[PDB]
Amino acid sequence: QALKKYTIDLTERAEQGKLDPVIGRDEEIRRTIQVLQRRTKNNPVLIGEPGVGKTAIVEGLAQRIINGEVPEGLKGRRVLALDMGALVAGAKYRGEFEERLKGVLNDLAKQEGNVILFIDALHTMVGAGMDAGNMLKPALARGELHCVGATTLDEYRQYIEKDAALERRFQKVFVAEPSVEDTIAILRGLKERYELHHHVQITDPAIVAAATLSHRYIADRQLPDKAIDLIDEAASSIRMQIDSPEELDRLDRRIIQLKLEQQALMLDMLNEELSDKERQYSELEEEWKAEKASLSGTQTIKAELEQAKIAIEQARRVGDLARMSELQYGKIPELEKQLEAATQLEGKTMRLLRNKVTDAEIAEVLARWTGIPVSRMMESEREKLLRMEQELHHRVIGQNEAVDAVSNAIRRSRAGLADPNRPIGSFLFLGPTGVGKTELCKALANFMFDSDEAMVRIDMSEFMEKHSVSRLVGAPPGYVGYEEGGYLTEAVRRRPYSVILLDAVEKAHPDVFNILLQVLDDGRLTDGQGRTVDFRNTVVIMTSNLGSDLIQERFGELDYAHMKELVLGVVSHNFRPEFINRIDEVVVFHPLGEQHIASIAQIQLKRLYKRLEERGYEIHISDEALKLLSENGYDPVYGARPLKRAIQQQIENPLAQQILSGELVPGKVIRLEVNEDRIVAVQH
Amino acid sequence: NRPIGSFLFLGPTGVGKTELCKALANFMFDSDEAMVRIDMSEFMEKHSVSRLVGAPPGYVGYEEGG
Amino acid sequence: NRPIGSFLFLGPTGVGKTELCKALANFMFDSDEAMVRIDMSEFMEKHSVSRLVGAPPGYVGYEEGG
Amino acid sequence: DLAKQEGNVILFIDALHTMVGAGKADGAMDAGNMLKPALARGELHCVGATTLDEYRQYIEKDAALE
Amino acid sequence: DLAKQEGNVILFIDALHTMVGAGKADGAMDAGNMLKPALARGELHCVGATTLDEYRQYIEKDAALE
């Protein structure tokens, strides 16, 4: 009998309780039963996206057979998971796959509708050598086989609707993507199951958080697979936090360090200090063990409560009389009240940890799983984030407007208040150059990542032509670089939280601005292959200087408001009215001043000190030399880089001229003094 | 003989056009974005029909469909 | 973060500009014809952009760059 | 055999994308079909190790093993 | 058998790009994803030989064996 040798008895697994009780899929299970109780085309095959429960429907059907709540035409059936693996794996000699397949069909014919065939993974069947389709394509539409396939959406099109007769040998059953609250109920039943396994507790805000977050941030996988990804992962992580602690390892490093110190010293006092700290470490250790033991006993009585529920449902199947009222009125109230007694015992004695899983833990799982930072405002990053504008004036001096703006942007991201239709900040910088557009964005990247060029740095000055649209997007199918995909969307879907610089945006033929109409409007963009990328955790920033005459003309004697209004009119001359409505904030830079120039002077000096400290040399500067650099690095029209060219020439040429001269010695402070109008370099 | 709503919308900018379409999607299927939002701001060239429709046989993305 | 030096020479022709550059190359490698010489006077239309930086995906000479 | 070791064995694969399309033949068994159920119900403990490049090209095409 | 040789053998291959695309059949295994392990450890003392353009087209497509 091949049925012993080449399938899986799923009814035994459901009988022995190796399965997940599926909540829901009401219409689709009833649809399965509708399509199975026919005469010709007795074959449904479940179709949905991968994840939404194409195994879950068949296992929930199988349990309903075990629960016996089926319509009467399906009582007494069998559900056998057809193993393509062994049925191909034996087939060494000629004809063996076909012989075993024939013998399977004859044995299932001998049972006469007693066994509902369940092919898992339908597209594994087809190519097996004629060989595999045209043996059964006759026997399928004769009613003698009740097969329920279960396979993906894609493999339907690519591995079935090729051979069209095999396609008409079935019924599509469109398994839907599950919704929000249905996913919530599914998670509640499975919450009970993972609280069997992972020895923890699960909160209900954890449930609504897993639903809300998996539907909101991630795009790639689907409900209810990824909400289970969150819950199962957080269960294992909190299992590890109970299993591990930080204060214990702090005190452990302290006691081993003081032990090494006292061993080096052998005045003492450190025998007493080490005795006190070992006593404290053993006390925290014993509290740790007592807390772990309390949670252990809590979980043992939780699991024995669950097995009591299983046994009383076995009684509801069989019909034992005193067992019903006995198990109910004895075992349920006393074990639930001492489960709650152990729970409030945890609420009393857990000091040093977390016994539950809450929205904090789901948030921590989600941020450490993808990389969108939605975890709760921990204190150090909150202090750093409150010190936004303290930090930003250490790579951009002046220009307080957009400093404040991007401060607001990062806040309204991390506080969660922003509109989740749209990206965080679709900023747009103006102002004539030499003022710090590119530098504000570099300072952002270093702020957010501790990396300067770790940002998706599109440079808009290549897109003057009508086709670097399909540079950035992707290459549509049939063409050459389809198999790559673009540079924007690929580098965003690798890391969903990054800052797209768009340097020098006015250069382009405005088709790229149609692409950015989608981008800034709703944050989805379609790549070449057709699979969308969500931009709703990114800060799209564009720099330009389409207001050079205006701001260089009138930054004095004007406000910031009419400044913004008049340059907004100028951008409306250049850009499109479709587009500047989508901007998060049109901000207006302005030309720098003398304190600012002195600041940038000092910054370039400090990085030069760093460079020559990598050379290994020490440098002081005269303040009159700073006056040389200030009056040699000043102008209205060109902004900062006059200072950099003046620094570059009037320091580095005579300096390094003297360096490879061998005039200068490692060990002397290279003091920058002045001549009449040139910096003189002294060595003493 | 025709699809049901063969609509074309016009007007000034930002005035609830895509909103009305998501409002239908929220109505008909209780989901804001469950609607095929094919965006005609990618198709500024000839070969973009081969993006949205599909590919002729023998060539690159032919088995994936459009 | 900037390249080594970026100079705009000027003058009337035939005074030695190209020779200064070739003198650099014939110094730095002992070769005039080991440098990169992009004859920018060809570029009288806006295409040779897409001969020096390369032609984007979905176009002709894609896999050989600029 | 790994069912006969009860989770004592964490399986490791380097270069995971040798597995999608491993031995697809006259019998299109692929070693992806066979690993897919054990990978679903977590019965194995298989840790891959793949390049970020070929994760796109050779594994996101086989969406059920994604 | 070169592991048998106790590190006393230098492997020479001309047209290393040919070896990269050598066994790459439709859902099979090439020498590229088989020399991925024996070269990051490097018990196999390979020596390559290639043309500059087809290095760029062929091997730099495969970053790990790049």
């Binding site: 000699y93 000629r94 | 023998g58 690159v60 | 979905g58 | - | 439709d26």
Partner: peptide
């Protein structure tokens, strides 16, 4: 008697190109 041996079955796919005009 012998066994139906497995094969190798090398397959291939192709590419289009695209050429693009200028307006002026």
């Amino acid at each position: 008697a012998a066994a139906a041996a497995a094969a190798a079955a090398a397959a291939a796919a192709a590419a289009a190109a695209a050429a693009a005009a200028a307006a002026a």
